[model samples]
Target chain A: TPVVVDIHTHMYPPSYIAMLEKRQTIPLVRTFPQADEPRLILLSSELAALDAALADPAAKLPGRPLSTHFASLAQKMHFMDTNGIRVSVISLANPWFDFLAPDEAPGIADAVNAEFSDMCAQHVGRLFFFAALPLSAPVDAVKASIERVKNLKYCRGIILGTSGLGKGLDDPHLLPVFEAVADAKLLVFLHPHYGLPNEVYGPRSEEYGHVLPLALGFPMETTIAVARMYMAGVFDHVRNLQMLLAHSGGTLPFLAGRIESCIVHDGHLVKTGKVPKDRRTIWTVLKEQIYLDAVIYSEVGLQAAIASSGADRLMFGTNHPFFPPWDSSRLNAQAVIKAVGEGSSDAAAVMGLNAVRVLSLK
Target chain B: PVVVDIHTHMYPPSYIAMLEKRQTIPLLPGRPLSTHFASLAQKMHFMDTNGIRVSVISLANPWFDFLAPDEAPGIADAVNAEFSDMCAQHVGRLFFFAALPLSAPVDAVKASIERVKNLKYCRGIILGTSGLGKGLDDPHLLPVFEAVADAKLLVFLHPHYGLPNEVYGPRSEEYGHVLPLALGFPMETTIAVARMYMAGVFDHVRNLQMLLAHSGGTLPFLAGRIESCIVHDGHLVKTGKVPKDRRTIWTVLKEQIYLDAVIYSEVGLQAAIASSGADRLMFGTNHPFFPPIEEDVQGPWDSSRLNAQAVIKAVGEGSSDAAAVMGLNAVRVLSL
Candidate 1:
């Protein structure tokens, strides 16, 4: 039987949750009178609901329930086992180290990464992790954090948020951090944290809950982040850098052609010959340097991602604890089976073999 | 043999006069036949040059949104009248999407719809994301949608104001308008339409028909994710928004919506087709915007050719699917 590897699972260490509990603002935990578990609030969109819930016990609570699944290793193991996943590569979820003060980030990041290393050691062959970086700290500290993670036996890569050194991923000053990560042979798992401003969702956004921001804004944020890097020639500059984009490159495969068309047809890009014939197209970067997780819940999206980057570049992921469903993982596998023939080598690859080869898992 | 350009734009004389007077980002330059300048004659010539057999012209973006509450009704009347006249002059070669004074009172917007539906050349109305300053999903706008559907005119959805500038980061200006124009425009369209879908606008106004710009503004690609998010959303599930028998975004996409093939790539066009069948797509050229920078202005622009080529590439040249997407689809849907 083929090994079932999940590359997109999440686990926040006890120390990190403790840090969040100490905060008064968002990204904090609060226990409502009506709920047994403390509600884990992580978004600006949840702010209004949080206020409303606080004022009235009858009002609907904001954010998801902070379950033991969030911090317990036993629950994660059961989830992996029940979902038929043989190996799980975990990382801390969003708002990771991006919100901490510069002075507080380095120590917190070190502790979190060490906790992840300790967790992986107990599980040994069954688990691995993507370390977090202290992005709020100075560049030297960020680089040192990367160095420290590289030496950890269980750390295969680093999970990152869109905010890089507080300016965003396109900042030229952050190029050295990208260089160090690439030099250290660590895969960069780019995820979305801060979505678009709430105003974009209009006044009626509250009616739809978090759907607009989580579904559209989250993916769109990832797409824009990568597009900005591509526009800034980051991929070309850091040739060896490898990225694993969440939510299937956040619509990149579907929009790569449009981005390419825009670049080629752009007035400044054309007039300045910036879009040289030999320039690396977004498609080129997608195939060569990018890997998309099979987290897009539809056959249309999964097939498009496979089309954009080959089936080999796609690996199975279950955005566990966040989505909190074993069925979603099955749906992702089913989408793969539907896109490529079931029981074929292609399906086998997307399901697990691809992760094994890419991450060099035994 | 028909080549329909459903995604083209034109600025009637009155619209040009209005744009020239403004001093903001959406304002046009003073040069005639330059920026915000596409006359009936100029558009017809450009169509002939590009081998476009028919065009469904529309008032360009930032339409009546910027108009004062008192001034919107009169200006919308003038601009829409001018569009009707331009299409009449061209006969079979032209049709138009009428402009609405959304910034004006509800009665005024309804009156504008009543007037445009009576126009011989008016097939629909071109709408921006901002509807009455609240967005398309605003509950108050439901009556307007009902009126538009009741009048039996299609709504051509377009995008003007993109995301906030800060989303693109500090180095965005270096990339020119590519970030906003390419990514932001389509994203805006997607957000607007998604809001409508989530608010049950499609279910409320079942008879309403919307033609989405830029290949449904990445909706086809993100529909799966949106569906997943809805199904998994604790709030939506708790609130019973995720009804077991409720129509999915996929269903709404195929049934109530039409997509314009202005995405400029076969990959995007294919996904659009896959989501909403071939019969639901119409070819478009975003003309007068992506006009040739290197090539001569009078010659065939890449904007039109790229979209046409994508249809041919996705469904194969001269196939029935190509034939429908290229011309017949718009003709049947818009009664053009």
Candidate 2:
């Protein structure tokens, strides 16, 4: 029987929460007068609301409450068991090291990775993790962090944000880090943290709360990063680099055909000899080096993702501690069952078999 | 089944004169047939070759928005009048979506809407994401939308200025306009509509109806994620922004939104259909913009064929659903 595995789950360890508690900036935690637990705020979009809440007690709090599910290992396991998620490969959530001071990042990253390693050690087969890198540190330190985490037991890969030393993933300076991570065989879990500029959402974004930034902006950010890497020939340069895109490649699957159409039809690329007959297309990278999480909540998107990257490249995931009751995960599973037939081998592979094989999760 | 091209475009003589006067990116020469970009004869030839029975034309990007605020209102009047006269000559062969002086004063914009609403062959208005330099969500633009909806004209929401160039990274220049046109354009449309939804535009202006270009510009694919984000957003929940009875993006997509069949692939068309039913999907050619590089100029272009093939591939070659998407939907919705 195929045991369900979740590759997209997240956690902020106890020590990391303590670190956030002491911070003055975003990605920090603060206790609200009306709320029982410390409110965990991570996005820049929440900064204004955070200040407003501080000044006016009647104002609504800024972020989600720091619940036990966010940091408690027992709670993670319990939620997994209830959702029929047999094995979970966890990772630290977004805004990881992009904000850390240059000198402090490496030590803090090491401590966090060690904490994850300890948690995975306790559960052994049931728990594995994607380690965080001190991206804000020097290139050598970043490379060393990859090396250190590569040796840790149960560390399957590395979770990354779109920003790499503030130059974005397409920066030439980040190529070596990609090469190192690829050389170490750690899959880069490309996620989005800093969404688009607030100006794009218009002046009335405050009225809509975080919907614009969190929804459209986050996925759009991920899509732009991967598209940039593709344009920069990062995948071509670092052949072993594998990326598992959050939100099912952030609309890449649906737009790959259009992207290809645009490329073939572009006069500038053609004139520059960039559209070589042998040049790799976005579709090529999607199938060859990319894996998509089935975290997209609807069948319409999941079907497109499955179509873009084959069913074999997709793995089931639950963005737990963020969206609970596993509703979206269940919807994802149902989409697979409907796309393929119910109880079929393809359904089983998407649910768990693919994750087990891809991550080598025993 | 009668074939219709709901997504074709044309810049009338007056509009071309305005474009020819400028030396900017959106500028065009008086002669467009030399490069296959702006030509009325070429549009008709392409439509006839593709078996299209009727074409609904509109002014292409940077429409009237680039004109000086003072110059905008008069130029819009001239351009729209030119389009109406062109449609009159074509008779049953051509119809048009009027261009609005979105950058002009509010009263002038409302007047343009009133004028176009009275134009014989004008079925709707072609709108870019930018509204008065802010965006569609600008509260100041609310009365403009109300005026448009009151006039009962369809808003063909298209994309013009894509996201900032910085987001595409340093190597973007190497890829040409592919990154911006493909990813950025659609992302722009998606952001605009999402912002409008967030601003309660759909609810406040219940009669407002929009046709999103590039097949809702990734809205169908991202709708689920948007819903998930909204429900999970802690700030929204606390701020009472999450109305228990508020219309979801999904609701707006099904109810008030129509998607064009210009996405170029069966996968995209399928998602668009699934999100907004086949009854709401309309066929478009995006003519003068994706012309076949090597094919015969008067013969079929791959751009039109790509979208037509998608409709066939998605709902079977001769199915009722295919017919509806290809032309029937547009005929009924646009009153062609």
Candidate 3:
């Protein structure tokens, strides 16, 4: 009952903030006249708000609230301690070093990960991190960053977005990175930042705020990204590669059977022998290598997830500070216990034991 | 099991007249214009072979959305007339969702709704995600929604124009149409309905009912995340954007929305039943489109088999819930 771990927490250190401050694009952070500290802007969905805030700073705000909870380690722990969370395996969140230029990425990755290690060292037992790799960099640089993060004493895994080398997770060029992470025994936490295009949401998208993308497109894109990876045989190529999918594997759990049916029925796939006798089905990968977070709050949603990928494979998740109510940690854990039962082994496993076993959290 | 096929599609003669004229459309015979689309005889055979006691057909996608704005309304009438003919002359088993002239201005869309409203066999209007060239969320389209709701018309929301192709990635071609049709189509549907939900369309038009394609396009699955975001959105709370009697998406789902079991997965159908309850779901074959899902080079019979098996596997074979999902629900929901 005592072991409560949040494997889905976000850590934005000063260096990562500094990089965003310098950028000019969607993932950038810039101070506006409307607010003192720069609001954290990300996604195509936020472009209207970003532009509107830029044109007239007095209009409405752009991006999310940027403050201690947005960055400071103390605040992460405050919510954790307040909610009785004993351990947090934090990561750098999405859009992580994805936009960096190849020439500058390697050195910047070293610096960012070094600071993550330093942050964990301050409260070693209570904190661990999933380090970010410079995905935009050359293969060699990316593999080297993998080594760097693997060597970091408190780093348990590496965080990634759907965008890999700019084409998406399915790109053939990204295979080596997957294999390299697998070799290093790092948990690849696949997340989604670049959602489906804003055009899909429509012309008057600004009126809906971020929900049009973050809640919908974000999850759908994560589903597609992983779906692409599965179709391209990434899981088969790197069999032991453990991936912890964010937002309960997007909609992956619910849609896996559909993906399988489409693959089975497609003539082109059969003609090309892409559907081989020994090929791994997505269900196989879900049970073997994939871990889903408990961020999905719907009763049916959680039930579907547990149905697809077993209860033990689910770990406690709280996208802290991003989605507010510090009690988010409680809500996520609450659903699992309620679903599994009081004094159930499945409850203990999902709430904390899964993380400890998988990530080796001290 | 007295089965019903609710999500089947057809390319009416009038709708096909425009597709062949378009340059971008391939001259391929296997395109949506296949005889399987326009042939009522073949549809009867398909229904007979599949043991479907009732078939609710609709005009397939890229419907009238591409028609010249001025020409859309007349063509919509022609399309609806043809569907009415198919239902009236041919078989008592068929009910059709009439096509709408949404590309034209608001009055044309409302007029089409009224015309279809009068047709005896036109159970609903088949709607694309695009409304008045903006989107379903565009406030300008509010009047059209109100008209449909007022007519007590069930809006069948389908997606033909998928998300921008680049998200399929460079290797997408190697994967056949799996990524686009499987993930892209449903994903597109999910986004459009999500925008409508977020923009308060469901809340504003409390009477509006939508039959979401592809099991609410993963809406049942991702709603958990959407709700998490809504409850945690400080902006929505601080700005008083969220109302006191605010209809949460969950409420909108069971109250205003019905789901089609065209998802091709028992896991997916289970989530739909859980989120919307068993009574809200109706079985669909998504025929003519998933005809590619044949067994050992057989015809399109197997796609319907998978859909039928999903209902049986999910709710249990020969159960009351199974009977309701198979046909009774559609018979009642569409008032056959």
Candidate 4:
């Protein structure tokens, strides 16, 4: 395949930054003169920093330092060039457009999509993108945004958060969105944002840094979301909806057999005929429609991902602009190398070939 | 080779009758008695529903049915003999885990262990973490544990208390024990024995053999925590309280610890094996507890075999170890 690609990368267009600058929640930006980029702190993990930064500017910064690397096209290209990633299908990362004013959402969406479109025009064949949607806006507007993103030549899909109309992806209100996206043949990238209820982290969580939430909570949330959706008949209702679950199906492949078993064994579900013999199984969805990101960092995790959804269904992802260079220079380069060593040819497919083949990113 | 069941269960007949008589939580006698067994859909499913070829049945929980302390010994004999009777009925297909009266005095506990030794089909004695209501780590239970180990009966350590009933938070009581069963059970099992390890239970009772339920109650998940604890413990590292050749939680898992593959996920199973070797892992169906809600009794259970399949998938399908984990390994390890 044509030099490995990184299908999962993030960039905040300059316009999105303006929106974040005016906000106060997690999706907002906090600046430190010492740090180069404004850190994009997402999740309850940053509550400590959110509190401290609000209290004192001089305190140990919250979340991660948001560098120019998060927003600049030149830096994005350099990141690709430096890490040997030949093509990149970048997207607007989590909490993107979810916190916008209802009136401001559509315009912001237009601007962000245009910014990504213009950036891809510059790189020509080197860059493609998954456009972000204003999920919290009106239904017509959200549908309109999907149509708008579809018109862009390089837009392959829309990046989504677990929140669908504030109920969850399982909500019936979002079924039309799933149907529209499936009709447009655009993949809905199901990523986790809410995380688990804060209490699951237990009392000693903070001492472990972001490990508990990032490593465990995120996957757990994803698992719960998909499980709930499957239980609620969302998958069956939206039969054509193809989804690529982030974090290796949010631990789904490992738990699918169990969830399937749980459903079939559950008296409540059985009585309702929800566990019917002809039901669409999670494994079937995994094999056919579900794609996973090979970003799980461990062999067992990578293997489980592969086992859950085969090698062809997996794509190379760097979770770019995050988990970068904690102790090393720029971990994406080393992480790719380590992933190559850990995942082998499967790593090759995940790196670029899989995306090239699946997305038909010629 | 005989089918060695590393994950079999028991509720002494006395325990069963007590449950039949009790009116409160867990002992509600599960109204709508089953055609096969007088239990709820949950308990009935466990008895008649599983796909297991041969199961080592035990007296269901609240064994001895919480009888009087003075009456502990006579009931212990009756329960153990009752299991012997069940094994005699099923013959080659069934064996038993005789329940001991941990509520009884030390003399009674020792005598029960001695009594189990003479019963041929009785391969092990099941004991809860509550050792005379003092917990497993108490020095008082050491004599009993030593005696059980000395008798060579595998001590099946199961979790009943499940974390003091407070950890579930306000939302729990509304959810009907799922949280406690799903999360609390595992967390409790890990904590109780972690304390025992901190107290050096394994070091003191070197010969003691034990198996933890619910796949070590997240012990596989928490082994990293337990290992981290000993390494970070100022007290453990300072006084050199840590055993020189002692089993790390990982070593305990790989060497002495056997995890029932009851955890529902592959990531969990992978983590389980990563800590405890595949050889040490055993297949278990938290029978009666996680019974299928709608499926037939004579058929396979995805819940039960999902765990078995997890071991098979994790280690290679049809691999020798897969067969071992499914049952043969339990036979070899427990010498059933």
Off by over 4 Å in 2: A324-326, B23-35, B238-245, B294-298
Q: Per-residue alpha-carbon lDDT of model 4 for B1-336, expressed as tens digits?
A: 223444655454355674566566454212233433432233334534454555655665656536668887787887678778767765566677888887777887888888889996877877766667756666787888788888888877777765444333332333334444444455456656665665667877888777777666545543432453344333234356565676665556665666767776675777667756767777777654454444565466556666655665678776786777677867766666
TM-scores vs. true structure, each candidate: 0.97, 0.96, 0.95, 0.70
Question: Candidate 4 lDDT, tens digit per residue, A38-128?
Answer: 7667777678757976677776566766677778899888877887778998898888888787899889888889889988999888898
Name the weakest run of 10 consecutive residues (lDDT summed) in model 1 chain B: B27-36
Name the 10 consecutive residues with the lowest summed lDDT in model 3 chain B: B25-34
lDDT of each: 0.88, 0.85, 0.83, 0.67
Clashes of 1: 0
Candidate 2 TM-score on chain B: 0.96
Considering only chain B, what TM-score does candidate 4 achieve?
A: 0.87
Superior candidate under TM-score, 2 versus 4: 2
Pick the winner on DockQ between candidates 2 and 4.
2
The TM-score obtained for chain B by all candidates, in the order given, is: 0.96, 0.96, 0.94, 0.87
Interface RMSD of each: 1.8, 2.1, 1.9, 7.5
Binned by DockQ into CAPRI classes (incorrect, acceptable, medium, high), candidate 1 is: medium
Rank ordering of all candidates by TM-score, starting from the highest: 1, 2, 3, 4
Worst 10 residues of 2 chain B by lDDT: B27-36
Per-residue lDDT for A144-261 in model 3, tens only?
Answer: 8888788888889989988888888888889989998989889989888888777787776766666667888778888889989888888988887899999899888877877887
lDDT minimum window of 10 residues, candidate 1 chain A: A264-273
Lowest summed lDDT over 10 consecutive residues: which window, candidate 3 chain A?
A323-332
Evaluated on chain B only, candidate 1 has a TM-score of: 0.96
Q: Give the per-residue Cα lDDT of candidate 2 at B59.
A: 87
Clashes of each: 0, 0, 0, 22
